[PDB]
Scaffold this motif. Structure first.
Motif, mmCIF file in Angstrom:
data_model
loop_
_atom_site.group_PDB
_atom_site.id
_atom_site.type_symbol
_atom_site.label_atom_id
_atom_site.label_comp_id
_atom_site.label_asym_id
_atom_site.label_seq_id
_atom_site.Cartn_x
_atom_site.Cartn_y
_atom_site.Cartn_z
ATOM 1 N N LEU A 29 5.793 -7.113 -6.446
ATOM 2 C CA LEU A 29 7.069 -7.814 -6.498
ATOM 3 C C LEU A 29 8.064 -7.227 -5.510
ATOM 4 C CD1 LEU A 29 7.241 -8.376 -10.369
ATOM 5 C CD2 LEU A 29 6.678 -9.948 -8.541
ATOM 6 N N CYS A 30 8.026 -5.908 -5.305
ATOM 7 C CA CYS A 30 8.961 -5.303 -4.366
ATOM 8 C C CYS A 30 8.549 -5.549 -2.922
ATOM 9 C CB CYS A 30 9.068 -3.784 -4.582
ATOM 10 S SG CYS A 30 9.508 -3.182 -6.242
ATOM 11 N N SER A 31 7.332 -6.020 -2.683
ATOM 12 C CA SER A 31 6.877 -6.280 -1.328
ATOM 13 C C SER A 31 6.872 -7.758 -0.973
ATOM 14 C CB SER A 31 5.477 -5.696 -1.154
ATOM 15 O OG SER A 31 5.457 -4.398 -1.695
ATOM 16 N N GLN B 275 0.827 -1.198 0.000
ATOM 17 C CA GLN B 275 0.000 0.000 0.000
ATOM 18 C C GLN B 275 0.863 1.251 0.000
ATOM 19 O OE1 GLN B 275 -2.822 -0.693 -0.738
ATOM 20 N NE2 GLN B 275 -2.879 -2.831 -0.055
ATOM 21 N N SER B 276 1.918 1.262 0.814
ATOM 22 C CA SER B 276 2.699 2.482 0.949
ATOM 23 C C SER B 276 3.563 2.735 -0.281
ATOM 24 C CB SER B 276 3.555 2.416 2.212
ATOM 25 O OG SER B 276 4.097 3.685 2.529
ATOM 26 N N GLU B 277 3.953 1.685 -0.991
ATOM 27 C CA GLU B 277 4.645 1.881 -2.257
ATOM 28 C C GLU B 277 3.683 2.371 -3.339
ATOM 29 O OE1 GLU B 277 7.451 0.786 -0.835
ATOM 30 O OE2 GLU B 277 8.961 1.293 -2.343
ATOM 31 N N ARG B 278 2.406 1.970 -3.260
ATOM 32 C CA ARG B 278 1.410 2.301 -4.283
ATOM 33 C C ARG B 278 0.987 3.773 -4.265
ATOM 34 N NH1 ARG B 278 -4.724 -0.067 -4.293
ATOM 35 N NH2 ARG B 278 -4.000 -2.245 -4.520
ATOM 36 N N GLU B 279 0.960 4.393 -3.087
ATOM 37 C CA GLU B 279 0.758 5.823 -2.826
ATOM 38 C C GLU B 279 2.027 6.637 -2.694
ATOM 39 O OE1 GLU B 279 -1.435 6.903 -4.060
ATOM 40 O OE2 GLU B 279 -3.070 5.453 -3.952
ATOM 41 N N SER B 280 3.186 6.066 -2.969
ATOM 42 C CA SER B 280 4.407 6.846 -2.830
ATOM 43 C C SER B 280 5.298 6.736 -4.063
ATOM 44 C CB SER B 280 5.162 6.404 -1.575
ATOM 45 O OG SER B 280 6.552 6.536 -1.756
ATOM 46 N N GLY C 268 -1.442 -1.194 -14.803
ATOM 47 C CA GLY C 268 -1.456 -2.515 -14.187
ATOM 48 C C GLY C 268 -0.071 -3.097 -13.939
ATOM 49 N N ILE C 269 0.883 -2.834 -14.832
ATOM 50 C CA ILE C 269 2.232 -3.347 -14.608
ATOM 51 C C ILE C 269 2.868 -2.699 -13.379
ATOM 52 C CG2 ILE C 269 4.527 -3.305 -15.530
ATOM 53 C CD1 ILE C 269 2.890 -5.606 -16.478
ATOM 54 N N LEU C 270 2.634 -1.405 -13.177
ATOM 55 C CA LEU C 270 3.168 -0.730 -11.998
ATOM 56 C C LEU C 270 2.656 -1.357 -10.715
ATOM 57 C CD1 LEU C 270 2.889 2.991 -13.098
ATOM 58 C CD2 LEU C 270 4.957 1.569 -12.791
ATOM 59 N N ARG D 87 7.427 8.783 -8.721
ATOM 60 C CA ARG D 87 8.541 8.597 -9.641
ATOM 61 C C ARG D 87 8.319 7.385 -10.534
ATOM 62 N NH1 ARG D 87 13.843 9.438 -11.346
ATOM 63 N NH2 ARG D 87 14.901 7.393 -11.295
ATOM 64 N N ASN D 88 7.703 6.326 -9.989
ATOM 65 C CA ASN D 88 7.445 5.137 -10.795
ATOM 66 C C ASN D 88 6.351 5.391 -11.833
ATOM 67 O OD1 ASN D 88 9.397 3.295 -9.602
ATOM 68 N ND2 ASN D 88 8.066 3.194 -7.788
ATOM 69 N N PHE D 89 5.328 6.179 -11.485
ATOM 70 C CA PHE D 89 4.341 6.575 -12.493
ATOM 71 C C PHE D 89 4.963 7.474 -13.560
ATOM 72 C CE2 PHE D 89 0.124 4.976 -11.395
ATOM 73 C CZ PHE D 89 0.342 4.445 -10.133
ATOM 74 N N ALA D 90 5.828 8.405 -13.163
ATOM 75 C CA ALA D 90 6.546 9.170 -14.182
ATOM 76 C C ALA D 90 7.294 8.235 -15.119
ATOM 77 C CB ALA D 90 7.512 10.161 -13.538
#
Ligand SMILES: CC(=O)Nc1nnc(N[C@@H]2CCN(c3nnc(NC(C)=O)s3)C2)s1
Ligand SMILES: CC(=O)Nc1nnc(N[C@@H]2CCN(c3nnc(NC(C)=O)s3)C2)s1
Lengths: 410, 410, 410, 409
Positions: free
Chosen positions: B281-283, B243-248, B273-275, B251-254
């Protein structure tokens, strides 16, 4: 029991006396050259025996013992198949096959910026192997002299680090590849050259060696060092190449003044004299055969494999191999490390100095370069060698699929 | 002759019957764990037998064979000291020393980017070793789960290359480090991300895995693959971290929109969807111990050392190790490659995945990071390890100065 | 003495009464349109008298006096040749000549990324002129609506600087061109966009205007500004262009997320809402005629020439013209500034907003773009125009060689 | 009517005869100096008469005419206040105020890389103005020689474009600012220097001038050219500065060899000799007064304002002014163009050559530089100047808020 005797039985094969040519043939098939410096006493004793006993060239146990005794340890390692590549005759037949296949890659352009590289044939092609145990093989034009050019950069960096230490050297030169298009900048952000394998870094490294002595002795000192690396095989010098590089090296003079301005040299450096030294180091001549021994010293932890001589500290050899890995093949370095995974260094004369750590050193030479400056036949060869054999830095020695492992038997 | 019985004499030690704890104790000191998956049949036989006779639990010749017969080949190598590190107990004594010296480096900052890595203490420090033969050692907090973060990048690159092949994967992602002066660009000049070890490259690699099945199945498939890699040791998932990576990940959306604009994804990719998949994967969660087994699979040509299962193609394991070598430690990769000379990959939860090819895999974990993003205690340990042992990719196995070689007996 | 009287004699040409069509003709030849807002009272009374006195159409002094009395000051500058370009009929004949020569430059490609810009013809070509005195001339397709696209960027910067001031605005956006080899970076070294004329700079500037109110009011507020700048001539909106701009702005979303991550927006900014606002500002529609008045407002120190209204502060108009000068024509800005030396801004619909300071504003529109994004016919026109007239920023008003100076008489 | 007479009465003010000092004072207050080359004949005639009648030196109509007749058009423009800045004494009073405020800006570092700039004081400060009509004003140290350094770069560029043409010159040198992230590369993507105002660009432009002639003659010709530009006011040469720049231009030798390798020079170029020439050009000396006249030629379309000589083609002057705008103040160029909006060129000796097109030329000089290489007092002065007067290139001449317009009454 006695070690000279057990070997006698190994070769005598139930017979009474050993024909001396039969002993020589068994010796050569290990990969050893009968001219191997570590075998001088044995061959001197054999040649004397074929004088003193000029009737029938036969060795009994008593006579075999006296000829082989001084070099007995090496002869047993050779004959008990203890060398790094035990079936050396098998391996060289593969080298020859890769050699012939690369020969058909007739593309590329010989570097022609000075009239001295222009006079080389596109068709000259040679590969030479010297293992960490001194086993030798050559095929193609392996006794043709040519200049080292940038293939000297790892050698002289190895020398600097050997004599000055990691700390000192890398106060003046970086330790990283620049970035696939920072090829045009001479300095990193610390105002040091990126690494010793680019021209500015090599120029800085040239300026670290044997400070305070004049150029004649600096050169002599490096030559003496390269001679030991090559087990005293051919190391020479092209004055012609020297004159043409010094009369046409505007870019290197540009590097030289830039480095002086940004104070990149040790204090008291005569930059233009250092540029003179640099042009000399690039016109040192080798052959495929002699240079393969230099690379084998680097594959062998700094001990020359055909003499037993410690030439370079382990620290010098590791740093050199590390930076050849990432920085040694011009703009092709990153692709080369990925697909070949071996430390190698190319020069504009078409040479590629190849190190398979703990296994062997090689020199490949074909003058035609590709658009990146790397020899077409050499590059083609080094892909094949790693595609056939599990020599890639990150192959596994236990699980390696269909690849061949020449270090092993059956 | 009989290998179960000559083994019985080596352990029975001239005496008649073996107390079972004497066999268990002898087993553990080889480095093997009693829980080794390759030893289950033998352990199952001890579990049956130590049930039957709770008096006179000692194993006679017939009974010892009956328990060890199924796994005798593996037990023979362990007891005849045929493992990569023969004297494992000495080795772990050095590992324990390196651990304590790293433990005192109290500098660095815990990542304070999410509330979930922030809730980890600076005092956590763990190191775990699994050799290519399944020998295991741990010290510190080696059973505390933590997220892989960027240490998953080599693993997901490994899978992608395993399933699709080198050529295909690298239509989409480069294979070189960018240059510490191009760490801020998402694409090289060929409009691919520089390598799979940076966020833009990992994001592209996420998009190649199991195309055309939905994200739920893709995640399951990666988890099943990671399970084989760690020999079915602990692999989990942190929803909180997700969750915290998804709202933070602004830079990944850029990165995601830039890659979509430049047509960097395979056709039919749902970028947003890939993001989401990428954040999952990072969690993925591991321990030092289970992650150390994952690294040992990479040290062992893609065969899991505690199960013997072929998990990754050698091509997959080679490419991954090549890219961990130059790209695995953020801006410190070039310095790490020079001084440490091992494939490693760091992540922001304080993990460093370390591979010693043909020798061992490790996971070090300390949350406090240094200014470049690397675990302080981890980085310090990996210097001492290579300063103590000739594990540097370009150390020499024959001449290696003051270092220790744990593969050797005397 | 009296101005209504000598002006009457000026036109009367010794005759007693003036045919009203003669007054209209003399007026139009000055450049003024009879519809000029500063002339409404005079025209209302003339139309009134052609009702009340359908016996005529002659004007004696007293009747002429009562019709012109309200707008007499402006009519005197018009008739005593006091306008910035006195011989306006000559000047338009030259504009017509340049129009025809540009008209034959049939190269270039219409923008094809959205279904609404693709649908504009290569044959459309129009140039409209409005001097700082309200003199008007048009040739070609000057009443065809088209979207402003990047030609709105200077306008909204002007609004931003007008409402917030130079210092505040440029806390968020730089004031320099990036460097013709930096078209691809979103931020300068201070982590601000390079200037307001690039997409990232415009996106930041969009986020400064009328903060804290919703997008509907922000838009209305800007439209309300564009109406004043255009003297209330056509300013519209293409919803179709808007929809396709939002479905095709992967790169703009890439910019917005990058800008948010690097904290480039004012606090409380809804970045994704700001992107929608920006897509709206880019779909505002003009004609060449109405937009030439907007440019003339910029040529006139922020006063609209056809209304006398103060629209923008001088500080705002100066900053804008400075950045149109160096950053206004995509990668051609440096060449355009060198060879043309005029403030200009191009957009992807084929428009070029041109300002000749203290003289006039122009809009040229031909949809076919060149490989740099600039309208082919537009670019050709602005080269010929400055080759003909001493309008270059750094031409001299005393010595100008082959050039014509339309500000002069004989 | 008679032109000498209508002027005579305006000055006579209904009186008998004009005292000669009263005519001279009225002359000086227009801005013209009595030494103006365009006034020589009138001054020659005044010195002749000041002998004949060494007692009661009054000019009657007949005698006044005899002195002014030759230069009457210029004296009429001056006395009917037709000059570009009509109330020049008011204007110079503002110049002096800007000068004094800048003088209190005592920061910055005198460049010390050669001993010849090191030997200059931090407190030297002078400003000089010459309008497009020859009006002159100075305040501070305006007669102290100092080397031009990079303020020669536009001058020699102007000469090259004057003699060889835009097309030829820019076959070899670009016409754009590089980007604050390219000040360290010598070449743009086309393998030309970015513009003539950077060292690599100026080094190339040096190599275009008067080719095939030796360095002695090349230097002579540039000097003769500078003499015309400055209306024959002071132009000199510092051998000392020349020696120290030639013994320390490792960066410049680096540039030269790099340019040589990438073949950026015209055929038959002797690079190392070109570097020698380049060091010479940078050691040319001026004063604020003489250099302000050079800038006035550029403000005046290539005509020298105090002699009337055509010096540079209009094409040369426009290109020069365009690249001074965007490339003239080292890394501060973009900031300077935005806030000051005038073509200017600074050099390491602390000078700033300032051009207000169609109005005036200026030279400011204070040796202390700021961290970007620009004179601190000079930089401060030109900010104040444009904050007071609507001289910014993109100010409006009609609507300009609270600012001053010295061109109007
Ligand atoms: C061939 C090539 O260069 N391809 C590219 N890949 N990625 C690029 N730029 C991405 C997107 C915009 N970003 C940046 N903007 N500004 C920066 N620098 C600073 C000092 O702020 S980095 C990051 S261009
Ligand atoms: C298109 C193009 O690339 N044009 C070029 N022009 N000039 C070049 N290199 C000259 C010579 C080497 N110099 C430099 N080295 N390192 C630097 N930057 C830093 C941070 O150290 S600048 C400057 S490349």
């Amino acid at each position: 029991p006695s070690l000279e005797d057990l070997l006698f039985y190994t070769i005598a094969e139930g017979q009474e006396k050993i024909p001396v040519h039969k002993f020589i043939t068994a010796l050569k098939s290990t990969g050893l050259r009968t001219s191997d410096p570590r075998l001088k006493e044995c061959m001197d004793m054999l040649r004397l025996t074929l004088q003193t006993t000029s009737d029938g060239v036969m060795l009994d146990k008593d006579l075999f013992k006296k000829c082989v005794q001084s070099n007995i340890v090496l002869l047993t390692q050779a004959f008990r198949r203890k060398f790094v590549i035990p079936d050396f005759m098998s391996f060289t037949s593969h080298i020859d096959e890769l050699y012939e296949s690369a020969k058909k890659q007739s593309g590329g352009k010989v570097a022609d910026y000075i009239p001295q590289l222009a006079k080389f044939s596109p068709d000259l092609w040679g590969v030479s192997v010297c293992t960490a145990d001194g086993q030798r093989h050559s095929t193609g034009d392996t006794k043709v002299p040519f200049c080292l050019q940038s293939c000297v950069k790892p050698l002289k960096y190895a020398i600097a680090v050997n004599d000055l230490g990691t700390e000192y050297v890398h106060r003046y030169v970086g330790k990283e590849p620049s970035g696939l298009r920072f090829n045009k900048l001479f300095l990193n952000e610390d105002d040091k050259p990126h690494n010793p394998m680019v021209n500015a870094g090599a120029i800085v490294v040239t300026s670290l060696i044997k400070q305070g002595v004049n150029n004649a002795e600096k050169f002599d000192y490096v030559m003496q060092f390269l001679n030991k690396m090559a087990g005293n095989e051919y190391v020479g010098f092209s004055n012609a190449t020297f004159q043409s590089e010094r009369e046409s090296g505007d870019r290197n003079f540009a590097i030289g003044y830039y480095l002086k301005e940004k104070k990149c040299f040790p204090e008291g450096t005569d930059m233009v004299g250092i540029l003179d030294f640099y042009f000399q180091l690039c016109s040192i001549e080798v052959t495929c055969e002699s240079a393969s021994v230099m690379a084998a010293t680097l594959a062998n932890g700094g001990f020359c494999p055909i003499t037993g001589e410690r030439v370079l500290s382990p620290e010098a050899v590791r740093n050199t191999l590390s930076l050849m890995h990432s920085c040694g093949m011009y703009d092709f370095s990153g692709q080369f490390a990925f697909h070949v995974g071996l430390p190698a260094k190319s020069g504009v004369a078409g040479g590629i100095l190849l190190v398979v750590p703990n296994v062997m050193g090689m020199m490949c030479w074909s003058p035609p370069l590709d658009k990146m400056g790397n020899s077409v036949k050499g590059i083609h060869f080094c892909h094949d060698l790693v595609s056939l054999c599990n020599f890639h830095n990150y192959d596994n020695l236990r699980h390696f699929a269909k690849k061949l492992d020449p270090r092993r038997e059956g």
